[PDB]
Amino acid sequence: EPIRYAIPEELDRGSLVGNLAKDLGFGVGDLPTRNLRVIAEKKFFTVSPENGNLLVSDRIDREEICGKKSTCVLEFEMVAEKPLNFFHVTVLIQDINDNPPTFSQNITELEISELALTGATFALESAQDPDVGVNSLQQYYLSPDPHFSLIQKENLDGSRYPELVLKAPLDREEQPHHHLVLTAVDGGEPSRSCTTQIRVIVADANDNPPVFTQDMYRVNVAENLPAGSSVLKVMAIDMDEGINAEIIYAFINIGKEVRQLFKLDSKTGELTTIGELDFEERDSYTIGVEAKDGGHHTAYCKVQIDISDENDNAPEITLASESQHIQEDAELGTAVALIKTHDLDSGFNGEILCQLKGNFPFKIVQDTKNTYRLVTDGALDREQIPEYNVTITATDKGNPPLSSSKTITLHILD
Amino acid sequence: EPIRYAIPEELDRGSLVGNLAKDLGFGVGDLPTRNLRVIAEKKFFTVSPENGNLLVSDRIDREEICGKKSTCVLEFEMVAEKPLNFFHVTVLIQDINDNPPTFSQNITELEISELALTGATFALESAQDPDVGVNSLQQYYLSPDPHFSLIQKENLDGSRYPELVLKAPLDREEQPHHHLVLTAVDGGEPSRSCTTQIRVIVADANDNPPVFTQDMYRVNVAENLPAGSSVLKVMAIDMDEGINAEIIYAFINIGKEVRQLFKLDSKTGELTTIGELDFEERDSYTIGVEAKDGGHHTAYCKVQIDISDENDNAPEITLASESQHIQEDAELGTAVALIKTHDLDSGFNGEILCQLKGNFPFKIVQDTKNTYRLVTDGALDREQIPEYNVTITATDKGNPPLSSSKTITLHILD
Ligand SMILES: [Ca+2]
Ligand SMILES: [Ca+2]
Ligand SMILES: [Ca+2]
Ligand SMILES: [Ca+2]
Ligand SMILES: [Ca+2]
Ligand SMILES: [Ca+2]
Ligand SMILES: [Ca+2]
Ligand SMILES: [Ca+2]
Ligand SMILES: [Ca+2]
Ligand SMILES: [Ca+2]
Ligand SMILES: [Ca+2]
Ligand SMILES: [Ca+2]
Ligand SMILES: [Ca+2]
Ligand SMILES: [Ca+2]
Ligand SMILES: [Ca+2]
Ligand SMILES: [Ca+2]
Ligand SMILES: [Ca+2]
Ligand SMILES: [Ca+2]
Ligand SMILES: [Cl-]
Ligand SMILES: [Cl-]
Ligand SMILES: [Cl-]
Ligand SMILES: [Cl-]
Ligand code: NA
Ligand code: NA
């Protein structure tokens, strides 16, 4: 008048809630004349009209009735007749730990960049529990891992929530994935728990610059190398992923004489020629090469292209004389013509042998390495032979050898 | 025998190179009988056959003749007749500073990320100079800038090259571009210089996490809110650029009861409803909201959606009686029926006025706020009126008010 009992949830049917008749001043001597009965649209309790006992009639699930409410009370009216009267009854439904905690998904992915500093904190999804009180108060535990630990905090209402903490730096180059296990154990009786797996995927950062396989790429190519030919191929390695690893090669500090001669592929890094090499013009090229990635990390190496000499220049003859005139009475040994040979090549390709083709009354006398004198060696008479067509030949010592001829007409005078 | 002169380049035509006749033992008394002349395919010098002077015949450009060679020598043969003889002459061509330095392009762009540490070094393109010696030895100067300075180094051959150095950190959020000026001055006489402009473009880094405009978005909506209605809109601001600024919003630590009720757009961040709100079930929702960017920076806020009560539940009447029986000789005031009203709403929407419709020999007597007793108030006789159809009405105090009726038949007994 009124009265309030208190029973745990999930009791079997027919469990004694109370002695409503005894507790409300009734006597068994008038248990039937009064005809007590319960009145409620929910068939949760029934009054035994023989002895007056309030009993459980159906399943009383506190989670379905009150949910997350801190208190669970069921209010109804027991009505009696002769005389008619209402008797308000309230029954408190205590919570039992009959529900385990749960996570939203069994496996959760978490993207964390390798630039995360030691001590960085990342939010973790908390567990849910339809119970109340200590039966839903959770305790979180992370399985031991060399890189990640767990800190546990509490909200302003006392409920716990976990956070992942980084205690050792990450390196996608070393380990791109970490598999963690999280467990939630409630504080009810008995203890109930659940587990979820966290796949930490290490997001790539551009912490690795390109690295050339060599700080110097040296090669020797002949000067008669056709245009478009491959000469060498540089190579840079980037340990990072995606755009952080795409490398673009380019020449640096290059001149127009080399810009019109060589080409470096931006992607493949293969060096080729686009013009004609000439040993007589330049015998070596030192070129700086730069490699860049997506994050603008740079690396620098050098390329030395040495050019070897080829015998692609024929010897040259230059002649002089006294207006191509010779007096017929000239003494033996008189200078008649001057010979000057020259070859643009080097080594034995540039060495010159100069000789006289024919059977003339003349003779070549060598003065220096590249200077000769055509001198008279025989008789002369304008009446018999008025002029001589003297042919001088020059041949280098290359492989294959090259040669050239030059013929001068020498007139005989009286 | 031989002889080697030395003249600067770019001399006017007719400039005296030397006195070849005097220097080679010749005398003017036989200047004509000898007929000295120069022999070379390049028309660079001519011998005056009157006095024997070697003179400049055409333009002698050392850059076109020898290029970048440290020394420039022109070797030719002066030939004399009567008697015929060769005379080797070498002429050293000195270099003058008649060429300015040059850069490949007037404006150069350079991408540098704002993560560049103080002291970082970046390669700069060196200037080119077709001169040699000190006339091509360059000196680089950077115009004063608060963020960038310049260091000057030298290769193993003594040639200088510049490098840009960062002395103050970069912040694309503060200044995305820096305009620098580079000048190269050679060491010749007179000094020649050239300028190039360097547009440093600051590459964006994800150094700015998202920032919510509010740490709490509170709003009050009625329970009869139709599904699909907009309730609020969160907002996060990211100062960075591109993917580093694209923000994705999502709920965190959400349950299935709320997952089936609310929806948060990943792009617009607009919160809407997808189910039906019921004040009788839950009057408030506190939801955690997460905002992420491309670099996985995170921000967290909260959203509180309060639900206000609406009068959408009609009052309910529950009746009891002694098998719907009344004895005709019952005394005035006898309990005949029990009335139990209840309303699920709150406030005045839940307050109940219970009244009797009709002119019966009965009367409602209130016992508690929600319990009444139908009591006899008049005469009774089964021979005259054997039964009464008593209609009880209940009306709440909401706006608009709701009501309900329930009619019970009470039989009159002898
Ligand atoms: Ca339960
Ligand atoms: Ca429970
Ligand atoms: Ca539990
Ligand atoms: Ca790394
Ligand atoms: Ca990396
Ligand atoms: Ca990289
Ligand atoms: Ca050649
Ligand atoms: Ca050659
Ligand atoms: Ca040759
Ligand atoms: Ca010049
Ligand atoms: Ca010059
Ligand atoms: Ca110069
Ligand atoms: Ca910044
Ligand atoms: Ca930024
Ligand atoms: Ca950002
Ligand atoms: Ca409602
Ligand atoms: Ca309502
Ligand atoms: Ca109502
Ligand atoms: Cl009583
Ligand atoms: Cl070059
Ligand atoms: Cl002589
Ligand atoms: Cl929730
Ligand atoms: Na003769
Ligand atoms: Na009567």
Residue numbers in the entry:
A (entry chain A), B (entry chain A): 1 to 414
The study reports:
We determined the crystal structure of PcdhγB3 EC1-4, the first full antiparallel dimer for a γ isoform. Peak 2 was monodisperse at 80 kDa – consistent with a dimer – and readily yielded a crystal structure. This dimer is consistent with the PcdhγA1 EC1-3 crystal structure, validating the previously predicted interface, and with recent α and β Pcdhs structures, confirming that this interaction mechanism is conserved among all clustered Pcdh subfamilies. As expected, each EC forms a seven-stranded Greek key β-sandwich motif, similarly to other clustered Pcdh structures. Notably, EC4 has a unique β-strand arrangement compared to EC1-EC3 and all known cadherin repeat structures. Third, the PcdhγB3 EC1/EC4 interface is much larger (BSA = 976 Å2 per protomer) than the EC2/EC3 interface (555 Å2 per protomer). Analogously, purified EC1-3 constructs failed to dimerize in vitro whereas EC1-4 constructs did, and K562 cells expressing ΔEC1 or ΔEC4-6 constructs did not aggregate while cells expressing chimeras in which EC1 and EC4 derived from different paralogs did.
Protocadherins (Pcdhs) encompass about 70% of the cadherin superfamily in mammals, and are involved in cell adhesion in the nervous system of higher animals. Clustered Pcdhs, comprising the α, β, and γ subfamilies, mediate neuronal survival, self-avoidance and self/nonself discrimination, and promote dendritic arborization in neuronal cells. For example, Pcdh7 is involved in germ layer differentiation, and Pcdh1 and Pcdh8 mediate cell sorting and migration during gastrulation. Both clustered and non-clustered Pcdhs control these phenotypes through homophilic interactions of their extracellular cadherin (EC) repeat domains.
